[PDB]
What we know:
- By secondary structure, this protein is α+β, with helices and mostly antiparallel strands.
- The protein has two domains: 1-162, Ricin (A subunit), domain 1, CATH 3.40.420; 163-246, Ricin (A Subunit), domain 2.
- 37% of the residues lie in helices and 22% in strands.
- It contains nine helices and ten strands.
- It has helices spanning 11-24, 86-91, 111-118, 129-139, 144-157, 159-163, 165-172, 183-202, 231-236, and strands at residues 2-5, 27-31, 34-37, 47-53, 59-65, 70-76, 79-82, 101-104, 208-215, 223-227.
- Strands 1-4-5-6-7-8 form a six-stranded mixed sheet.
- The longest helix has 20 residues, at 183-202.
- It is classed as ribosome-inactivating protein.
Amino acid sequence: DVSFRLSGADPRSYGMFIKDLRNALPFREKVYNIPLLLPSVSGAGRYLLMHLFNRDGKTITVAVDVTNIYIMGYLADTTSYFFNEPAAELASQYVFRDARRKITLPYSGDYERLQIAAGKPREKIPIGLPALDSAISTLLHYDSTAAAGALLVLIQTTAEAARFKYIEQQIQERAYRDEVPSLATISLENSWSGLSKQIQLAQGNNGIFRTPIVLVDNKGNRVQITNVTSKVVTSNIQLLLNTRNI
Length: 246
């Protein structure tokens, strides 16, 4: 399991947690020195449990699918909550089985349903370490509208940070003040799947991408990744989604 405590947290410890989180995922290969995530894992071993403590020390346990690093649900003292989609229902067989109560949230856990539920698009929710502390507090007492926003902040400060070094570094920047994500950040979150595919396809095409990926990213709007020597590949993307799962 991996843990993070917001009390005493600074850009350094967060980075340490994110490094642990990455390291906790398994992989067999490395495509271009990036860890390729497994296509399938079976049983309880498919799920990683994160323990998040807020400043006051209250805690949730979050369940993450190690094949794609998707949050399945979480446990707040004696109640588990799970997204409304078949994968989370499947997870519910293996995790938080000792919970006194299992609640299914009125939505699936993809951004589009989550933004609708929260009333705000991602572009307008401040993320940061202060926001994560808040998120954790929100999740401790059920409110499904308020939990959609907390989970948009939770996904981004853990899963999206594990996935991309740029986004992890954004959050270290937001360790004592929250700020809405940059466009680059929204660009990157959306492109993980395509990027993973094109990088995997590039083996046996000389590191060249079959189809160009256009990121808005940090060229204001409209960058285009063509091959694996791009910095988004050498320096940024940190875990690849296995093509079988794409």
